């Protein structure tokens, strides 16, 4: 139940470690009603946060595989798209705002403001 140690493991052993932490948390809820003890109930929060870091590694691993899977695809799932804000997502992209028509391309070529200076 270490953060950096659950990443080298594979999907089969992470799930096996996940359910073994849930059967341990279920036995703590049984002791909580049966009276339990000090050294026994204080581990409920420890096991709760353990299944949180085990389940975190599982979630953020399958998304990295999906992001590598949809890499280069023209159409990606909505959750894999950049969620900046509703206004930014509806703005002109860098390609569409850099488009310069053939008229102001010639106007910006020979009528661009030059670097000058006045003596006095």
């Amino acid at each position: 139940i270490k953060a950096r140690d659950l990443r080298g493991k594979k999907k089969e052993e992470l799930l096996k470690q996940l359910d073994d932490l849930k059967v341990e948390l279920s036995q703590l809820r049984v002791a909580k009603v049966t009276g339990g003890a000090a050294s026994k109930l204080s581990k409920i929060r420890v096991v709760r946060k353990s299944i949180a870091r085990v389940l975190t590694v599982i979630n953020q691993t399958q998304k990295e595989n999906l992001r590598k899977f949809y890499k280069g695809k023209k159409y990606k799932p909505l959750d894999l798209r950049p969620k900046k804000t509703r206004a930014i997502r509806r703005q002109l992209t860098k390609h569409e705002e850099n488009l310069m028509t053939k008229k102001m391309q010639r106007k910006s070529r020979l009528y661009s403001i030059r670097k000058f200076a006045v003596k006095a």
Partner: protein, 86 residues
């Protein structure tokens, strides 16, 4: 009569809990809440009541998904990268 002998016949609810504002203002017969305007698509607010607007404005609740926009704005809505590991 019109007083004590008439307050005893009050056993029929007129309003109930709404599904949009959680207030006891959903009229049963009219099928329309009297505080949020449900089921109309627009919430009812009126400028002749500054106190009624102060109780249900943006910010009097939690702002779950909006307090995150305030935190992501101060960095430029950075997404897709990770900090330098140790």
């Amino acid at each position: 009569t019109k007083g004590t002998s008439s307050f005893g016949k009050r056993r029929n609810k007129t309003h109930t809990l709404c599904r949009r504002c959680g207030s006891k203002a959903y009229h049963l017969q009219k099928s329309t809440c009297g505080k949020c305007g449900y089921p109309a698509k627009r919430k009812r607010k009126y400028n002749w009541s500054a106190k009624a607007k102060r109780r249900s404005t943006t910010g009097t609740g939690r702002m779950r998904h909006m307090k995150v926009v305030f935190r992501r704005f101060r960095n430029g809505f950075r997404e897709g990268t990770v900090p330098k590991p140790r």
